[PDB]
């Protein structure tokens, strides 16, 4: 079991953006994941004054996207089927403004051309992170721009960085909520590349492949984390009577294939986050392809007649995302 990171109770009444001269900081988190994915960059910026942040995945060429918005409490802007960037942020609905900062900077980079085909498209999604801190500072337009400016190829700052600065898990009761973080993982299989990025702020808890609860719902009185279903079932016997994420790959997929891939990978995250896709969550996954590599025409291999196709890619990517969720909770 990891040491606890209890968020502690929120002291409400704290200052907001207008009280500060807010200074973007490039997020470095606890350690840097390095990987090789040409054409993809990541920037993360935060305000210490929150603490809260945004994380921007920039794909300058633009890339086909499916969105799976699955929770009951989704905060999403654009949700486009083609994106030059994905912006994830804290600050609840207010933090969608970070995406406008990214959009504006892309327009300027494009010399303010505005033909239909040249529109710079940014989809943004948010987590509510106001309970995990004592200020009302939200990621703003300037912070979005900073995150884009900080974006570099082949790097991701793990842990408390960017949108993950004040992410937290395990919300049966706030006294047992723990700070998580943001996480990424990367796998290369021949020419195939899969990057997962995740900012888990779940009502549920993070669970590992052995079924151990590793982050969220920590009881200080007992020193142990519990699966929420134990609390829930006891409450019923007694009283009766959000995760935002992206999977980026270079494998060509049709719009239909890509959408089903998104749904598959997203549902797969109920393994590592439990419960998941609840009415209290606004879980949103972006599936993005750079469309560089074809699947073979027939799905066969030494490992099986139906072994090479988009379902197979979905299963592999599902493991990469689990690894990312675990990096976040570490």
């Amino acid at each position: 079991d990891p040491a606890p990171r209890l968020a502690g109770p929120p002291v409400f009444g704290g200052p907001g953006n207008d009280a500060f001269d807010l200074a973007p900081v490039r997020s470095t988190g606890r350690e840097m994941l390095r990987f090789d994915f040409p054409g993809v960059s990541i920037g993360a910026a935060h305000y210490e004054e929150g603490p809260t942040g945004a994380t921007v995945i920039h794909i300058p060429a633009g890339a086909r996207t499916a969105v799976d918005a699955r929770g009951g409490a989704v905060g999403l802007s654009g949700g486009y089927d083609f994106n030059h960037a994905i912006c994830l942020a804290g600050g609840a609905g207010y933090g969608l403004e970070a995406g406008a900062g990214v959009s504006d900077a892309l327009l300027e980079r494009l010399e303010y051309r505005t033909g239909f085909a040249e529109l710079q498209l940014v989809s943004s999604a948010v987590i509510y992170d106001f309970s995990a801190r004592s200020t009302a500072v939200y990621p703003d337009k300037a912070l979005g721009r900073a995150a884009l400016e900080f974006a570099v190829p082949g790097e991701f700052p793990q842990g408390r960085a960017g949108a993950g600065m004040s992410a937290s898990a395990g919300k049966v009761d706030w006294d047992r909520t723990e700070i998580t973080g943001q996480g990424a993982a990367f796998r290369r299989l021949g020419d195939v590349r899969i990057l997962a990025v995740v900012v888990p702020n779940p009502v549920g808890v993070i669970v590992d492949r052995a079924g151990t609860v590793v982050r969220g719902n920590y009881d200080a009185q007992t020193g142990v984390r519990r699966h929420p279903v134990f609390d829930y079932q006891e409450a019923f016997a007694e009283q009766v009577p959000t995760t935002i994420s992206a999977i980026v790959t270079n494998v060509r997929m049709s719009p239909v294939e890509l959408n089903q891939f998104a749904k598959q990978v997203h549902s797969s995250m109920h393994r590592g986050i439990q419960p998941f896709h609840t009415d209290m969550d606004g879980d949103t996954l972006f599936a993005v392809t750079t469309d560089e590599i074809d699947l073979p025409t027939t799905p066969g291999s030494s490992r099986g007649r139906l072994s090479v196709n988009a379902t197979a890619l979905g299963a592999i990517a599902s493991e990469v995302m689990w690894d990312a969720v675990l990096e976040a909770g570490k």
Copy 2:
């Protein structure tokens, strides 16, 4: 590890319905689950000539329903937001006919009244089970009627029964596909009741709470089952370059609450079935409430401030469904 139940390769060219004088059999499966849920009945009937079957959940008063049709290959009829019965069947799209048998018998029971408010509503979903046998016999109208006629309170035939007769799992390669079954589980918490019913015919495999693969993708050469992601990742390194279910409860939920509950419980099944919600699956879950018991107005209890609500019910029901999936694969 359970003994293998390999489906074996299909011998194609087999006879269909018109070759037989088809005789419904009341399915008893391997053992009977008994439970107490007034107002709910289950019947299961099969044709030995398939073997293939249908399973009918009958709720004569009628009950609010949400449908979560999540796969890429869904075969569904009605999908109504209010149902007097749910009919699950083999026979791929052809087996949707069983539901028409249930509908017709309900109409007759209603003395052929047809006012809007008296329409008898049956939603049906199917699995493709033609690979797991050597005939083209599909559940028909007569078999649907038989299943309804066989329906009794408080009983469910586990295993190879009804729609589960020729269900199978683990389809990276047919040489490793195993027969599953159908399954149910029941929990009562004070006055709250939760029944799960499932017919897993997944491309993926059934996995237990320890992460062990317990049914599907069995390799006769090695005597061991593998998680499909191992086959998939090796295939990629080499070559580059359906589950239908119902959750029935007596807790009142609004249409919005009930729909989100459906999505939550359905995603939860990616724990016990992996992969899940793939393009090759037609996964369909029905969430049905009898609307007999209110949740409290505020969600609080000794176990947490947010511990009694529909998300909490969803987490509990998710465990019941896992238990049902495991009964199916047993």
Copy 3:
């Protein structure tokens, strides 16, 4: 289209069900045959006089990519597949989905009971509630769907009271003003491009022509005219609150799944011109957009008539007119 001004009030509704009768399917001929040229697409229509009720089957043996736009709040749909060998439209409300099983079974038998994934015969079915327009509980069953499929003829469609349209009706602010409609089709070929529209309007609302005249439904026998329903609705409100259509559009122009799905929404929404109100909570409105994927639109959308004049949107506008013509044939 010369709509008949004469009323055909459905009239007010313990009638027997199917097995009370020895039901023999009848090949529907309706009031008139539409003839059209669209190889690969066949239509069969069958009814039971004992209803009266019927089914109408579009048979496309090659299979064809399909988008389903199920817009109503009372939809009755089976399959809803993104690829179909047949579309089955039927009366009998939810019970009439059984007709689609008859079609499915017949197609399976024709294949000699082959059941490989690529060989699965896919039929999508949708229904109208037509029990208020008659005094039996007879519905389109397995045998009637099978019969409609067997009666399917290339390049013909029976207009009017035929197949699913036998007891279709419009204008349901009050049943005293509800009129029998029918089914309808219309067809257009524009240099190679073929568009077929099929419609069974059983609307809560009324059928309206291009001039804005109500031509079928909401006939007040005390005035001998048809008003727009909104006039009744607004009077009712002033008083009491004091201070299904199922259709297919089939084309031979290739469209991606995304284009075909938006084409389906566009054509379906366009039917709120010919049927008013439309897409209501009591309607189960369902449109099937089908492409046989025979011919490509040019790579670029240009013509002497504009830079954005040859694309799927343009096809949608054109198909929307073919659908309006079909609605008006049903109401004629």
Copy 4:
């Protein structure tokens, strides 16, 4: 509504962006003020002359249950919440969603930066692409959304070229025939029942009146008339293939989420009467249906005007006429 027959061709399109200007928000007054009586619902409209481009904000401080019907194939939407304190409509395409952030920020500040879940200020925003109708890259930004919110006045709406409608335009088979539209509103009270419609039509299609006349968009300067786009589309096909609207409808009648969502689809589809074609792949058509949940429909739907005459469907029909009136004010 007396639509002006005179053309207002947008005309053909390296113009500078926001920071090139010292941008001062202007309170839009348009051509005319609509006045209406609907306590709790305010509208503010602000524009930058340097665009010209604008934002239009509907402010409902109590918060109100909302259904979003995003029907187009090119939708630009932020939030899309099922409960809103404001709806923000803007030009500037995707960049103009930023205006909604200005509104959101202002509302948060008004709350003194309280951030409890129940206190979250919810703004849904949708946009039109209005860059072809002008020669700058100026878009509605944070400051302009904030300004529109500050300018919001109970019971007034500026018709015409104002707020989001400043550079809205219709009829885009070819840009040479595209005309400037505007924004529009209309309001009806029927004994207690209040319905407000707000619309910013930037359609690919054209605005059409109740007689079926094209009144805005697709003006051919060589003929001095407006044809229906389908005439261009079908000629183009014969030749080349040889052998956004964002809107809100606000009412005070209580509707469940299910009813409100079907009400939204019904009213939105009804706009294919006034705008043709509509819901196309190049459109991002988005309608917001909002109820302030003030008054109940009777428990049963009866009246002297029919057994099914007082329900949400009826309200939908009535609101559909208010929306058509709003579309025509925008095109006037």
